[PDB]
Ligand binder design. Structure first.
Ligand SMILES: CCCC(=O)SCCNC(=O)CCNC(=O)[C@H](O)C(C)(C)COP(=O)(O)OP(=O)(O)OC[C@H]1O[C@@H](n2cnc3c(N)ncnc32)[C@H](O)[C@@H]1OP(=O)(O)O
Ligand SMILES: CCCCCCCCCCCCCCCCCC(=O)O[C@@H](COC(=O)CCCCCCCCCCCCCCC)COP(=O)(O)OCC[N+](C)(C)C
Ligand SMILES: CCCCCCCCCCCCCCCCCC(=O)O[C@@H](COC(=O)CCCCCCCCCCCCCCC)COP(=O)(O)OC[C@H](O)CO
Ligand SMILES: CCCCCCCCCCCCCCCCCC(=O)O[C@@H](COC(=O)CCCCCCCCCCCCCCC)COP(=O)(O)OC[C@H](O)CO
Ligand SMILES: CCCCCCCCCCCCCCCCCCCC(=O)O[C@H](COC(=O)CCCCCCCCCCCCCC)COP(=O)(O)OCCN
Ligand SMILES: CCCCCCCCCCCCCCCCCCCC(=O)O[C@H](COC(=O)CCCCCCCCCCCCCC)COP(=O)(O)OCCN
Ligand SMILES: CCCCCCCCCCCCCCCCCCCC(=O)O[C@H](COC(=O)CCCCCCCCCCCCCC)COP(=O)(O)OCCN
Ligand SMILES: [Zn+2]
Lengths: 68, 233, 29, 269, 125, 76, 265, 75
């Protein structure tokens, strides 16, 4: 092989690997329990469903019948 | 050769596929006749390119098995139930020679015990009923008694006789004009001239009897028997 | 002249429909 | 980064040769003993000539790794693996390629009973061992060294002479696997610092004296079993005696060298 | 069987039964060679790693001891076999199996005789 | 080579692990009562160690815990 | 039936044509080396020299047997697989209740070397063992010929006499009543016990019974063969527990049950 | 070069042969099945490559959302 080119890809590997060694270690530090996951809309199902059944017999405030 | 075997193998793929297609076609028409158990016996059987070469004037009984490279000369006869297998090496039968019913003429199946010898049968030879010939040479105008066994390397010289039921051990040479018998086969006596005359005349008689049986077997298959088998209940 | 097994004929039609419909399904997708 | 070399004869084809031989032999009937014998012998001989050529184009002035080529594993390219040799590994590749045809030739007379399984096992061994000697990565060095255990186990157990081959094969497998697991622990220990297993990078990272001591102990656990060093040498007499002749040849001539190669290649520098 | 043992015919593994041989209610233990034109009678037993010469006759309830070469009518001890000879027996069985492979490869799963039967029928209406 | 190293090695290791596997296999006694009792014991151990280990630390230590467990192997 | 039936039949015709064309192409690719299998030309019974075999109604003749020429076979006799009875230059006579075992050869001679040439005469209730050779000799009634034995021309086996398995009986030898002969050459071995006489008779009747099941199986038509194949497959295994759940009892069909006279008990 | 179609076809052919061998049948017992297997293997390999690309695409967005949720902590 050509000694000049062989010795040059050798430099690109290291320069690229010393400065490339940071990206993957950031994923390993990602929290498994995200910040405020219960805030995520998928977890607030009852907050959006229950108002739709708030007038259903069986879960009404007793005074709602007296005024309606 | 190797290319020939490759094409022979590929050929089997195409044939297997075509026959399966034919069975599919028959099934769509509601026919099951391809399920019939019919005999796959072949009187002459090839092993790749090793095929029997049989003279037109030689009788071969339909039930006989001739497998591989086997040569049968003019006026010779292979009788009912005979088996001749030359695959690892060759088997040759000369002219005017009778191989009697249920005889076995074969070569060594493997070269484990050394190089596989061929079986050479000369002209005007008589091979008795249910004899076993295994990789041996049998010269012209000799007599092999029925039920006798000849192992590989044996040589039966011309006008030699092997008595019925004899067991000729490996590499034994039977000299001319001598009668050998027993287990193991040993010299019994000398052959008389009347016995030589009977050897020749019995061979010529067998060639005529062969002719008669070949004419008998060559007759067209009877259609009444076919209809009787078809219409059975 | 004619295949008489009606259920067999129906099964043949079903297999043909499956094959042709599969070809059309691939072609138009 | 694709590190593809420019030379025609490279390492990947020399890896592929016995692999192709093994795949071809997989499908040939055991009745065709002559064909099996010739195909195996010729594959091994071609591999030997290929290694000789690799010697010819060697450059004896550089401290770098020569004929370096790369092989991608994932499209993410986080983990990408390199092969290459130097003046410490070249002759071991040559020795492996030279010894394998000798092994096929030693069993020539008994090949009718040996079958194609004998030749296939030795060819697979050849492929795995050449790979091991040609790896610029701790993790792949690990993976391909352990892989040789399977065909070596089979070789000792099947074609050994007497029933002591059972105990010999068990001990070989278990000792070698214990050492290998120790060095796997070391490999993971390294990966947690560096985030990589590429040999070239590890040659340019600085390890603490303390963690150098402990990682060196973990490497020593594997290598001393491999060498062998006392007192973990007792598997060797049993295994090298009970194995068939060619099995003993491969065990002593190549497999023993893997511990010293590991010392030269990872622990000392 | 005259011996009182069960009278099935058992030909065990790696056994070569020579051509033209007659077997009736005999047992052949693994790795044996039966010579051509031999006869094994009711209740007879051939022990493992033994060889019978061609033309041998084993009368009812007779035994061929393991590791021996026998022959004759009736069969008699000839000599004890060497270990190399006894190693050769499974090799002979394997070689014969290899030869049988060539014959097995000549036959497709179905024959084409039924076509001949079909046209023979059609020519008869 | 054939003495202490074998005993403190493959010979001794094989013996002790054979006896231990022997002992563990006998635990699977085939009696459904043993299997239920084991589940009850595991449930009791769960409650005891993981919730009723608050005031126990005054009289106990973790060292003694694990020691007595290992020491149980050398009984009868 | 109907238009759909006709269309499917026509498509089947096309598929059959294509399949046979593919088979021909494959045969061409093999270099035409493969000798083709053909319709069986073996004749179980054959004339020669205008002599027809005379075989009684209830004689088992295996399809693979060869009965040729001037051969007479009596009531209850059986000719087994691979047997050859070649009565072409002389007469062969087989008595009643006589079994000729598998792969046996029986032949005759037109003129012997010396003496009066005689036909082959096999008497009543005779057992002839597997792969024997009977040539121009006489076996009288209730005699036994061992498997693989050879009888040469002019041999006489007398009533209640035995020729041992593997024997070679030389020409014109006489086996007297009550004796067993064996070896090569055959020679006197010992007297026959009464239990062995009973054995010979038992042999003959057991064969008479075996011949019945073999004759019944070998004469079945294609349709019956298929019916019994299906029946055999259906009853090869069982689930009696599920049958008890269903409250049924599956019975073996009578076409799969052998007669008691051939069962080991 | 070495395309997914070729790898898949080779794997399908190998699958049919391996299946025949396991059943102690000749390698090429039903050759039309070998053709069918080559077709299915090619289809499966191509589909697997496409699915791998799509899977990486979805994982990218999902990791993006995880990263955003984590970065919301330092606000
Ligand atoms: C239900 C089916 C009924 C059938 O159809 S059975 C037909 C198929 N089976 C046969 O043909 C086998 C018939 N059996 C035989 O040939 C027996 O050899 C035979 C004649 C009964 C003798 O057996 P054994 O009584 O047990 O022998 P033995 O106690 O008398 O021994 C005396 C000496 O003679 C010798 N010997 C016996 N059998 C022989 C033979 N066939 N040929 C030649 N030589 C034989 C034997 O070696 C024995 O001892 P020695 O030779 O004096 O040292
Ligand atoms: C002249 C040029 C035209 C050449 C055409 C060649 C095309 C042939 C391509 C090969 C197709 C292979 C299909 C494999 C499935 C096998 C179908 C089959 O076996 O038919 C069976 C069963 O058929 C079916 O149940 C459904 C599949 C049939 C559909 C495919 C038929 C292929 C040819 C098409 C014929 C119909 C075209 C016309 C329709 C009106 C007939 O019924 P049975 O005998 O009761 O089946 C017994 C069980 N066993 C499957 C083992 C045979
Ligand atoms: C069985 C292996 C010995 C016990 C397992 C063990 O000790 O684990 C170490 C495996 O190493 C070994 O002990 C191998 C020795 C085996 C031979 C003795 C790795 O853990 P660590 O001590 O390195 O973690 C601390 C690190 O420095 C901080 O990141
Ligand atoms: C009910 C039977 C319980 C044991 C009664 C035996 C007599 C008294 C022994 C005893 O002291 O019980 C100790 C029981 O010892 C153990 O449970 C063993 C510890 C676990 C050992 C194995 C560990 C398994 C993991 C607990 O110590 P304590 O009584 O001083 O606790 C009082 C408390 O701290 C203050 O109110
Ligand atoms: C099988 C392979 C066994 C190899 C045994 C090697 C024994 C000598 C290893 C040196 C021990 C040693 O250096 O002590 C401590 C190692 O850490 C440790 O504690 C590692 C302990 C080694 C694992 C346990 C070995 C026996 C396993 C059974 C650090 O000591 P340090 O802090 O003074 O460093 C001084 C540096 N100049
Ligand atoms: C500072 C000083 C440090 C010194 C260096 C220490 C390093 C470790 C040195 C010891 C190395 C031990 C390696 C294990 C070798 C075991 C080989 C035994 C296998 C054998 O020969 O026969 C078997 C034994 O039986 C059996 O049942 C065997 C069961 C398997 C046992 C394997 C257990 C090894 C686990 C690792 C223990 C060491 C831990 C090290 C941290 C089979 O016999 P059979 O007839 O009964 O079987 C049925 C037969 N088909
Ligand atoms: C294009 C090449 C590949 C095309 C493959 C056919 C078209 C695809 C349709 C699906 C094919 C799936 C595989 C079909 C066979 C599956 C396994 C069936 C084997 C089986 O047990 O049942 C057999 C039914 O035969 C059968 O199932 C086969 C029936 C007839 C199909 C064979 C014809 C294939 C055509 C190939 C190219 C033809 C060129 C001209 C168009 C009865 O087995 P058996 O008793 O019949 O005999 C077998 C001798 N061991
Ligand atoms: Zn004759």
């Amino acid at each position: 092989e050509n000694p000049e080119e062989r010795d040059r890809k050798a430099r690109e590997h290291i320069y690229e690997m010393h400065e490339r060694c940071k990206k993957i270690k950031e994923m390993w530090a990602l929290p498994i329990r995200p910040y405020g996951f219960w805030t995520f809309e998928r977890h607030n199902a009852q907050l959006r469903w229950d108002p739709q059944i708030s007038q259903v017999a069986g879960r009404r405030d007793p005074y709602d019948d007296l005024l309606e | 050769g190797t290319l020939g075997r490759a094409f022979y193998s590929v050929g089997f793929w195409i044939r297997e596929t075509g026959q399966a297609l034919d069975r599919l076609g028959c099934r769509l028409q509601g026919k099951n006749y391809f399920r019939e158990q019919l005999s796959r016996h072949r009187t002459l059987m090839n092993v790749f390119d090793k095929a029997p070469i049989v003279d037109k004037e030689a009788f071969v009984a339909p039930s006989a098995s001739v497998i591989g490279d086997v040569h049968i000369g003019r006026g010779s006869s292979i009788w009912y139930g005979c088996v001749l297998r030359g695959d690892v090496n060759t088997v040759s039968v000369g002219s005017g020679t009778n191989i009697q019913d249920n005889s076995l003429v074969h070569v060594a199946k493997s070269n484990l015990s050394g190089k596989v010898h061929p079986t050479i049968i000369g002209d005007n030879v008589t091979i008795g009923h249910s004899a076993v010939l295994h990789g041996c040479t049998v010269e012209d105008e000799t007599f092999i008694g029925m039920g006798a066994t000849l192992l590989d390397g044996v040589v039966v010289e011309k006008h030699g006789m092997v008595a019925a039921g004899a067991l000729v051990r490996q590499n034994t040479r039977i000299p001319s004009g001598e009668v050998w018998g027993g287990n193991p086969a040993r010299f019994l006596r000398k052959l008389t001239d009347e016995e030589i005359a009977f050897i020749s005349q019995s061979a010529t008689n067998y060639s005529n009897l062969a002719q008669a049986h070949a004419a008998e077997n060559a007759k067209p298959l009877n259609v009444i028997e076919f209809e009787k088998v078809l219409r059975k209940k | 002249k004619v295949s008489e097994d009606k259920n067999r004929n129906y099964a043949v039609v079903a297999g043909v429909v499956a094959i042709v419909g599969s070809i059309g399904w691939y072609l138009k997708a | 980064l694709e590190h593809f070399c420019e030379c025609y004869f490279n390492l990947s084809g020399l890896i592929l040769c016995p692999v192709l031989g093994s795949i071809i032999l997989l499908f040939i009937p055991n009745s065709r003993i002559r064909l099996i014998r010739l195909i195996g012998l010729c594959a091994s001989l071609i591999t030997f000539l290929y290694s000789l050529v690799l010697w010819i184009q060697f450059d004896s002035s550089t401290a770098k790794f020569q004929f370096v080529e790369s092989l991608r594993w994932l499209p993410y390219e986080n983990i990408n693996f390199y092969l290459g040799i130097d003046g410490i590994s070249l002759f071991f590749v040559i020795l492996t390629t030279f010894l394998i045809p000798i092994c096929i030739l030693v069993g020539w007379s008994g090949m009718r009973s040996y079958g194609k399984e004998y030749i296939i096992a030795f060819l697979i061994c050849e492929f795995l061992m050449i790979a091991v000697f040609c790896m610029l990565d701790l993790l792949l060095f690990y993976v391909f060294f352990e892989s040789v255990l399977i065909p070596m186990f089979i070789i000792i157990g099947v074609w050994g002479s007497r029933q002591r081959k059972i105990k010999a094969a068990y001990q070989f497998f278990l000792y070698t696997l214990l050492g290998s697991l120790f060095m796997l622990l070391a490999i993971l220990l390294i990966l947690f610092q560096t985030g990589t297993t590429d040999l070239q990078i590890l040659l340019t990272t600085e390890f603490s004296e303390r963690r150098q001591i402990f990682l060196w102990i973990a490497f020593f656990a594997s290598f001393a079993v491999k060498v062998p060093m006392v007192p973990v040498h007792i598997w060797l007499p049993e295994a090298h005696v009970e194995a068939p002749t060619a099995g003993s040849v491969i065990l002593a001539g190549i497999l023993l060298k893997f511990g010293t190669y590991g010392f030269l290649r990872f622990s000392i520098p | 069987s005259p011996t009182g043992l069960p009278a099935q015919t058992l030909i065990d593994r790696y056994v070569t039964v020579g051509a033209y041989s007659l077997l009736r209610s005999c047992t052949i233990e693994p790795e044996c060679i039966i010579g051509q034109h031999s006869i094994l009678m009711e209740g007879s037993l051939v022990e493992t790693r033994s060889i019978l010469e061609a033309g041998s006759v084993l009368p009812p309830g007779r035994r061929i001891p393991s590791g021996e070469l026998w022959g004759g009518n009736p069969a008699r001890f000839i000599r004890t076999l060497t270990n190399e000879e006894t190693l050769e027996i499974p090799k002979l069985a394997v070689a014969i199996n290899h030869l049988s492979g060539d014959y097995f490869s000549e036959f497709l799963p179905y024959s084409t005789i039924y076509l001949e039967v079909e046209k023979f029928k059609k020519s008869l209406g | 080579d054939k003495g202490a190293i074998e005993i403190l090695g493959p010979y001794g290791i094989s013996y002790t692990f054979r006896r231990l596997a022997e002992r563990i296999s006998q635990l699977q006694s085939g009696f459904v009562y043993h299997y239920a009792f084991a589940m009850l014991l595991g449930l009791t151990l769960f409650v005891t160690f993981f919730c009723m280990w608050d005031s126990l630390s005054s009289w106990v230590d973790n060292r003694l815990s694990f020691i007595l467990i290992v020491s149980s192997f050398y009984t009868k | 039936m109907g238009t759909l039936g006709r269309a499917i039949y026509t498509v089947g015709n096309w598929i059959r044509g294509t399949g046979q064309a593919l088979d021909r192409v494959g045969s061409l690719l093999q270099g035409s080396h493969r000798i083709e299998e053909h319709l069986s030309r073996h004749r179980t019974l054959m004339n020669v020299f205008d002599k027809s075999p005379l075989v009684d109604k209830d004689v088992f003749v295996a399809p693979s047997a060869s009965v040729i020429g001037d051969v007479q076979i009596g009531k209850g006799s059986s000719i087994w697989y691979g047997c050859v009875l070649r009565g072409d230059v002389n007469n062969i006579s087989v008595g009643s209740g006589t079994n000729i075992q598998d792969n046996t050869l029986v032949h005759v001679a037109k003129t012997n070397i010396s003496g009066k040439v005689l036909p082959t005469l096999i008497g009543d209730n005779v057992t002839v063992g597997h792969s024997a050779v009977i040539h121009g000799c006489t076996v009288e009634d209730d005699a036994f010929v061992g498997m693989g034995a050879t009888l040469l021309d002019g041999v006489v086996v007398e009533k209640h006499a035995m020729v041992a398995a593997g024997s070679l009986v030389k020409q014109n030898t006489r086996i007297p009543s009550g004796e067993v002969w064996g070896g090569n050459p055959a020679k006197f071995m010992r007297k026959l016990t009464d239990e062995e006489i009973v054995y010979i008779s038992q042999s003959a009747k057991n064969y008479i019974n075996l011949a019945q099941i073999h004759a019944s199986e070998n004469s079945k038509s294609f349709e019956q063969i298929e019916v019994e194949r299906a029946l055999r497959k259906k009853y090869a295994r069982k689930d009696e527990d599920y049958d008890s759940m269903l409250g049924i009892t599956r019975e073996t069909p009578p076409e799969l049950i052998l007669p008691d006279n051939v069962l080991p008990g | 070069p070495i395309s997914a179609t070729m790898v898949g076809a080779l794997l399908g052919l190998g699958t049919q042969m391996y299946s025949n061998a396991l059943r102690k049948l000749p390698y090429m017992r039903h050759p039309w099945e070998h053709v069918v297997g080559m077709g299915l293997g090619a289809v499966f390999a191509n589909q697997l490559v496409k699915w791998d690309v799509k899977l990486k695409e979805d994982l990218d967005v999902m990791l993006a959302k995880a990263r955003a949720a984590n970065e919301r902590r330092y606000f």
